[PDB]
């Protein structure tokens, strides 16, 4: 029985990056050729593994994380990177083994007048640890005066909307992103390629 990658890659709705979705993929045969033989992607980078060797490899589990960000932020979804996305929304570990796959989704996720439903976190007291998720909406105290749950000077709501309009430049157009993590633990493998 094939791993259900279509449920991730072809989902009608993608998460906002601050609330990024994770799907655990386990106890299935993964045919990654549906991915690496595709011409549909704008970014396809694998760390610690070559994607053309994946159909002959076994992992303990696979995780598929997904979200939308603007095109000029896809570069932050890589080990060691910084920026509002890497620091406050979605952080890969330095020793990441997996693939980062992205594609322009302008005709799905933008609209005339603006689609504002996709959010990212703009302020945080500290950087996220790898694979940490923060969905809190506490007012961010940027100064010495406590905010007491009310916004104002130096007291900001911490999430901001992207405003995706189709005439945006490509750096500001929406990109759907899927991060595949290939987990190897001292435990039986449950996700193998067809050749294994």
């Amino acid at each position, epitope marked *: 029985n094939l791993c259900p990658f279509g449920e991730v890659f072809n989902a009608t709705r993608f998460a906002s990056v601050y609330a990024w979705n994770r799907k655990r993929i386990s106890n299935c045969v993964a045919d990654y050729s549906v991915l*690496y033989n595709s011409a549909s992607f704008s970014t396809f980078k*694998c760390y610690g593994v070559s994607p053309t*060797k994946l159909n002959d490899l076994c992992f303990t589990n696979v995780y598929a994380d997904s979200f939308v960000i603007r095109g000029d932020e896809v570069r932050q979804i*890589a*080990p*060691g*990177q910084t920026g509002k996305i890497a620091d406050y929304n979605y952080k890969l570990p*330095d*020793d990441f083994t997996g693939c980062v796959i992205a594609w322009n989704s302008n005709n799905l996720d933008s609209k005339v007048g603006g689609n504002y439903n996709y959010l990212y976190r703009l302020f945080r007291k500290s950087n996220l640890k790898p694979f940490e998720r923060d969905i809190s909406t506490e007012i961010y105290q940027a100064g010495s005066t406590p905010c007491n749950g009310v916004e104002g000077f130096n007291c900001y709501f911490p999430l901001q909307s992207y405003g995706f309009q189709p005439t945006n430049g490509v750096g500001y157009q929406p990109y759907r992103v899927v991060v595949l993590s290939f987990e190897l633990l001292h435990a039986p493998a449950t996700v193998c390629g067809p050749k294994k």
Partner: antibody, heavy 129, light 108 residues
Framework: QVQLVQSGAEVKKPGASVKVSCKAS????????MHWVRQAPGQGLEWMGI????????SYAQKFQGRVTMTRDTSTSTVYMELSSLRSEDTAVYYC??????????????????????WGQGTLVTVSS | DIQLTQSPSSLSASVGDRVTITCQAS??????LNWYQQRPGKAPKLLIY???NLETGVPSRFSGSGSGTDFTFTISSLQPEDIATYYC?????????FGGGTKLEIKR
């Protein structure tokens, strides 16, 4: 929070050798290559070589082959550059520098990403009697 | 080895002016060309990588373009803090090499 902290300046005589260290912190040391680049006073930048922080394998620019060795100590997150048979032309600020990770593209080809996102503060080595 | 010829050697411009610096490679290096800013007494700082991509936090007045042998680095509106020497650097093929540097000075 990536930090690269180098050892202090030194003077060495012509014909001697020098060893400069680069202590890395704030990231997983063995996940990244380290490079060395030097700069003579008032001059431009010159690449010396690269070391794999995990297994220690190296590649040096041809003009330094036989004079430079790079090493790494993982338990102290430290990279070292030793340069021997020093001459006046070796008076320079030596920098360690860290690029991001290389990766495989969708077709399975290894892609290098050699742009230096983090630098040590530099170590001036003066070759003098 | 790949030689990078960087021009001009130095230039002087006013705050708010457009600054243009160029780098020519002796062979085709695709887009594997980076630009650094080195302020006096500091390590170089990466501003542009792979010909045209801004590093995190770099102001949007900086840009780069080009592919193959002829590259350009631009400051759309020069600011006082941009005083530095700028360097290009290729990584199409080792040894990695750098251009000779361009010193940017402000007329005030």
């Amino acid at each position: 929070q990536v930090q690269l902290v180098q050892s202090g300046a030194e003077v060495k005589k012509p014909g001697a050798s020098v060893k400069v260290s680069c202590k890395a912190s704030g990231y997983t040391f063995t996940s990244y290559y380290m490079h060395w680049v030097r700069q003579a006073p008032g001059q431009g930048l010159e690449w010396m070589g690269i070391i794999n922080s995990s297994g220690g394998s190296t590649s040096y620019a041809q003009k330094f082959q036989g004079r430079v060795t790079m090493t790494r100590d993982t338990s102290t997150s430290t990279v070292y550059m030793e340069l021997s048979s020093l001459r006046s032309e070796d008076t320079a600020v030596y920098y360690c520098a860290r690029p991001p990770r290389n990766y495989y593209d969708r077709s399975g080809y290894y892609q290098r990403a050699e742009y230096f996102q983090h630098w040590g503060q530099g170590t001036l080595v003066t070759v003098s009697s | 080895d790949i030689q990078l010829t960087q021009s001009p050697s130095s230039l002087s411009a006013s705050v708010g002016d457009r600054v243009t610096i160029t780098c020519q490679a002796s062979q085709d290096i695709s887009n594997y060309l980076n630009w650094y800013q080195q302020r006096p007494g500091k390590a170089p700082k990466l501003l542009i990588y792979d010909a045209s991509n801004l590093e995190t936090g770099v102001p949007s007045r900086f840009s780069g373009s080009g592919s193959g042998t002829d590259f350009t680095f631009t400051i759309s509106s020069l600011q006082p803090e941009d005083i530095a020497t700028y360097y290009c650097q290729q990584y199409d093929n080792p040894p990695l090499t750098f251009g000779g540097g361009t010193k940017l000075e402000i007329k005030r």
